[PDB]
Design a protein around this nucleic acid. Structure first.
Lengths: 65, 69
DNA sequence: TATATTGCGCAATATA
DNA sequence: TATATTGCGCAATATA
């Protein structure tokens, strides 16, 4: 029923709502992808810190010898 | 929209390709969500280890500085 | 030549 | 009444 002016307005508003809904869904998907990058970097940083602390513990303990 | 047989064949092939591409993208999203769960559990393990070792080092440093010269 | 990926429209459906 | 979400599809673009 493309000719009705009420139809044209309804499609106009739904197209706006559809694009808004899909935009939000895309941002949620990107946020999840970004969380993977953040956690990967943070886990690498924490592993480096584990290794640094272990080196410092071993150096300090060598003062016993 | 042509509407030749060549056009109908091209639309059919693209429609199949679109569904296959969307299925793959949705599966990637599911894998990414699982990856977040795996990395969060690993992050919690690493935070606990860093805290444990930091306390151990702090206590050992305190012991050594209680020594006289 | 082809398939893969993408933003979008439509209408049905879900929800307020 | 309204906006929000989604299966199906289209055509432009990206890629092989």
């Amino acid at each position: 029923m493309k000719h009705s002016d009420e139809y044209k307005i309804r499609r106009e508003r739904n197209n706006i709502a559809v694009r808004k809904s899909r935009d939000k869904a895309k941002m949620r998907n990107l946020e999840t992808q970004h969380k993977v990058l953040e956690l990967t970097a943070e886990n690498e940083r924490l592993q480096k810190k584990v290794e640094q602390l272990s080196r410092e513990l071993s150096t300090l303990r060598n003062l016993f010898k």
